[PDB]
Amino acid sequence: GSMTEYKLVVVGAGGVGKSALTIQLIQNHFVDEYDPTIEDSYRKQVVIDGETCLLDILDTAGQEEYSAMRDQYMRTGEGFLCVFAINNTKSFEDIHHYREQIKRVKDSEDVPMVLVGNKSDLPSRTVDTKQAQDLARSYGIPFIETSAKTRQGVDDAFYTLVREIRKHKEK
Amino acid sequence: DTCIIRISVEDNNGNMYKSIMLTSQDKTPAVIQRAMLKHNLDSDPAEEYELVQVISEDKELVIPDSANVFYAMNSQVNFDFILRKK
Ligand SMILES: Nc1nc2c(ncn2[C@@H]2O[C@H](COP(=O)(O)OP(=O)(O)OP(O)(O)=S)[C@@H](O)[C@H]2O)c(=O)[nH]1
Numbered sequence A: 001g002s003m004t005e006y007k008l009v010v011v012g013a014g015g016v017g018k019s020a021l022t023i024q025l026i027q028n029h030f031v032d033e034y035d036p037t038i039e040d041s042y043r044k045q046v047v048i049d050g051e052t053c054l055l056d057i058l059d060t061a062g063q064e065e066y067s068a069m070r071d072q073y074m075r076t077g078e079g080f081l082c083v084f085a086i087n088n089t090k091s092f093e094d095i096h097h098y099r100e101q102i103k104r105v106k107d108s109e110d111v112p113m114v115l116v117g118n119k120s121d122l123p124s125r126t127v128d129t130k131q132a133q134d135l136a137r138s139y140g141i142p143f144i145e146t147s148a149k150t151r152q153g154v155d156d157a158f159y160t161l162v163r164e165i166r167k168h169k170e171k
Numbered sequence B: 001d002t003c004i005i006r007i008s009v010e011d012n013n014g015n016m017y018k019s020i021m022l023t024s025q026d027k028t029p030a031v032i033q034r035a036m037l038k039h040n041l042d043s044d045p046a047e048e049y050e051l052v053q054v055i056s057e058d059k060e061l062v063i064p065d066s067a068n069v070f071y072a073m074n075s076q077v078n079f080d081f082i083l084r085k086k
């Protein structure tokens, strides 16, 4: 065998920062631009709890026009970053629909996932931290606030998702 | 009419590909321009680049510079293309 690879998928409503979070992780880079995604793919070699591994990251469309592609990438993906923006309440309520579609496609009640509240550098939040922490607890998953701009939580969010995958694969 | 194509570049930047939309009316110059924007390529003019379809392990199809892409591409294989400097 060789180095383990983890198929990670970043999902959430349009404009919450899925692509910015991925680009910050992979390239250590941030630019404020409007570039809606259809489907992008990245890779990075990292060390998590001493084990070198390969992250294969799929960055998906938040625009509902591309909603038909979800079934394929949810079958392939091993773990999911469910991203909302802390200044966009509708994106937080949209998390439910993503989670429910993933569970249905994978036919399982416990799929590796992490709840990500992005744009934590911005003022004027509308989703309070406790609300999001309480939802993640009801889902049984980790929660992390992130900023693609300041790098707050970025590595942690992807590393935590890998740890969740590793716990699932043993169970 | 339209379809999704995947565009890669050769830079070791950790990107495997980014997808863009292709229409039956696009010619190669407009596709190269859309690909370059997606990959943040702006220091060169579009004429230095070519668009290349991956057909198999050891065959590629250079899309001609003034062709309709729907007509010139191989519709029978995955829609993966490389954007690279001539
Ligand atoms: N201030 C701040 N801005 C952010 C952050 N993350 C993303 N943005 C900005 O928000 C906008 C949308 O980010 P983007 O990464 O394109 O969203 P997306 O989730 O990929 O959107 P889509 O492809 O599904 S349409 C961009 O302007 C980007 O610069 C962040 O953590 N802090």
Ligand SMILES: [Mg+2]
Pocket: A018, A019, A020, A035, A036, A037, A059, A060
């Ligand atoms: Mg995006």
